[PDB]
Design a protein around this ligand. Sequence first.
Ligand code: O74
Ligand code: O74
Lengths: 242, 241, 239, 240
Amino acid sequence: ENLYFQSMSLQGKVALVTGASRGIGQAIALELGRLGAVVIGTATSASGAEKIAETLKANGVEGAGLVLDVSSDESVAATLEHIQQHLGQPLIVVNNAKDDEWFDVVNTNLNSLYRLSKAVLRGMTKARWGRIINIGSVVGAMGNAGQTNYAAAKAGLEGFTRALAREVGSRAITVNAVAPGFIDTDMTRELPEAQREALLGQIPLGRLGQAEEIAKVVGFLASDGAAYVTGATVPVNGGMYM
Amino acid sequence: LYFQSMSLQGKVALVTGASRGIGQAIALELGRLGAVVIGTATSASGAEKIAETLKANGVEGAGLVLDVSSDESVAATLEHIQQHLGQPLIVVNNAMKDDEWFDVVNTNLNSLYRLSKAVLRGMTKARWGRIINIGSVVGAMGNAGQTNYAAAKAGLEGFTRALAREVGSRAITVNAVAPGFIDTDMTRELPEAQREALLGQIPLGRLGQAEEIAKVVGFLASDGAAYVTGATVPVNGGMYM
Amino acid sequence: QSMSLQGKVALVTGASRGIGQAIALELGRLGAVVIGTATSASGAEKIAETLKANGVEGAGLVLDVSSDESVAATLEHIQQHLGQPLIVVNNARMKDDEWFDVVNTNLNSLYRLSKAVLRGMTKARWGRIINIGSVVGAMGNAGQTNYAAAKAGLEGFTRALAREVGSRAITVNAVAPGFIDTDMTRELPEAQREALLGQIPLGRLGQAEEIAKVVGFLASDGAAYVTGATVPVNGGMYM
Amino acid sequence: SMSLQGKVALVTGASRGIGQAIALELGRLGAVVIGTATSASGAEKIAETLKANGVEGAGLVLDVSSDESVAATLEHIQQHLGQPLIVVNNAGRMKDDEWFDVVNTNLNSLYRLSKAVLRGMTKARWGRIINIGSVVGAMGNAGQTNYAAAKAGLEGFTRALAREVGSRAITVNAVAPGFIDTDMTRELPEAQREALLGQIPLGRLGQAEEIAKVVGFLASDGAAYVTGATVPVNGGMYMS
Ligand SMILES: O=C1C=CC=C/C1=C1\N=C(Nc2ccccc2Cl)c2ccccc2N1
Ligand SMILES: O=C1C=CC=C/C1=C1\N=C(Nc2ccccc2Cl)c2ccccc2N1
């Protein structure tokens, strides 16, 4: 009786989810796991990679926790070479991660997205199928410098994603992004209460978003039903736009 | 567990302009996700076609006649639905010359507003709702057609954003879907040279299928899209204009 | 010298004070003959006085852009007494549901006035239509909804009309101000003023003259390849 | 008012087309103008062009990709001509996979030059930075991708830098041209030219001087409350 929904299944796909040790990234690893995919979650530290592997086992999800530093050509090549040998090619990839800091931050994020994306693309090109999904940063940054950073990264993410989607379309690989708003995370929990209350007041739905609410959007994008969606940045912010 | 977030079991959905193409594909998708579905058309023959189509696909619901330009037709059709089927908590609005753009947008948005306002009582009572507006398909011939398309798209997106702000506190979401070059009876009328030129501008290298719109709509209608509101989701294979 | 509006006639609606006034004077000073308008006869007197006092040939008239009759009438008067206006500048606690009627009314007004002045511009094969958006300041969430809706509608409207009239060398542009020093923004309570200022990188309110200078440029021959554009003048505060 | 009397302006990539038209416009508005090029011959051409138009200034060699060339060229300008408080960044087979490197390079170059001229502008508590985007380069899909990526990057960058430097009364804006007369557009056969013109509501290509006038206005005191903006100068053809 629930059988129509088997077409949203990711049975037989392998998915790589960076920064999967907590919050949004973790909720995504579990959602893709639950949809049937084999899931490799990653972290910068060995302890995070352990936490991921534990978390996956505990939720009945085949896969692994690995260490990955997207700023390193070496770590990227190595991690992918490992995944292909032990688990399969990842055809679903989810990238999750002062006044003057904005430029270096955007420059670093996008050089990282490009490095990882380019590496997983050889596999997706051979398969003539792929899903690349870039997760933007959460709203909350304190003060003007934080607004500048957030807005810059969001503009860069959206133009990048659009462009890469044009570059890889003919190979039936989609490239999309998700732009969260005020989501309940460790980072937003550390905002002082006055600023949390002020952000809520600007959200039409009147609540913070849940990590799972980002993950579901990601899960849909990864499905065969989202196949004509590419180059898009989907905002998940309860109606609060900048 | 994965489908508790996808199911529309026990929801009622109203889908305008459901007699063919995109609207039809959406009626069927919401049906298949478990909703009771009322599809509508401007003519009695279209309303028959809808009801036939629904029965043939194993979907409980109805085909009705609805003219979104008429306060009377709207009030009447809703009354009928509440009495016979339940309150529609999912509503999907689907439905030249140089100077026609302004009237076209004005008419589209007045129609969206009229229908949306009427279904909002029901949603407010339930503290739950999904409104979803479907934008036009790419294909329009010449410069006047481009002006019309680009205006309607900008209007749809601003409108959707504003209504979403207005109704958010009641856990009703309002989103839109902006299709690109989709295979419809209208795009099939395009001569081959123009189809080929449009394809050439689409990174995926193909026209979109009506079902491909409908899946996006099905997702927006789900509980998993609950924090998505005010958004216009483009479904265009990477061709942005 | 090069940015002169010598020999052009300009119509500037809502010109009796603030932004509209500053624009009337700026175009006047650039050499144009200027007709400023107001909803009231007293405003129209004030405009005509203000123009004389600054050495600007033109007139103050009464105009209600919501009325087909007031529009047709005011234009008929201007053509008969002063020339065809080839530069036209449209200037002119809320509840959660008011946005739609407000936008609908603003844009129906822009369309009405724009369509009417277009016959003149078409004859001349030259024109400048310039739409001024509303000033930032609106109180609460309903006001933000309204401001954002009007701004989106202004931009799309301006783009579309620009496509329609381009072949006749008429440009259509808009100016989207931010937090400008006006009578209306002066009456905002201090907490809201302080909060807005804190969000402006330049760290100050904008002056009416600063909007007017942008408008003056758009009206010039040097802005001839600028059309369909909405130019933001907000000290770096975007939303 | 509109005069740039007493200002010094640095204009990169000034040896021809848009950059040249801007050098001359700022010159004619009264500024002292330093135009720059990657080559010594271009720098000669600039200096010749300035003298011929009655504009005090100089032609220098500048490679915006080099920290050394940047530091050196600024040093030279400060010593001989004054601090440049108006800065206009213009500078510079097509494949669908080139967009990233192009944007990464343009923006690293803007950042490098902008950061260097900011000390001067901070000390003066006045400045104008103006970034010129790329005209459309090629009619393919790849030409669209590149064009749209550069433009998106330029806009976000300009917006961010404007937020960073606003308190010091420095404005940062960009100008996004559409189609100007180029070798590429000159070679379009009549049918394709008509179709390109047909996508431009004004029905013509834009002149370098038309970009330059916009720049001149942005540089003036009248544009003081305009910052973070990208002003499109494309005859009504919008593309992204
Ligand atoms: O007329 C338009 C051309 C381009 C883009 C938007 C509009 C437009 N927009 C309208 N509404 C609108 C536009 C943007 C945000 C919100 C709203 Cl309601 C509108 C409402 C009533 C009558 C005419 C209207 N026209
Ligand atoms: O690669 C891109 C494609 C489309 C739009 C923007 C980018 C992009 N954008 C970048 N930066 C950027 C984008 C928007 C706002 C601010 C910045 Cl820095 C960027 C910075 C360093 C290196 C590469 C970058 N690429």
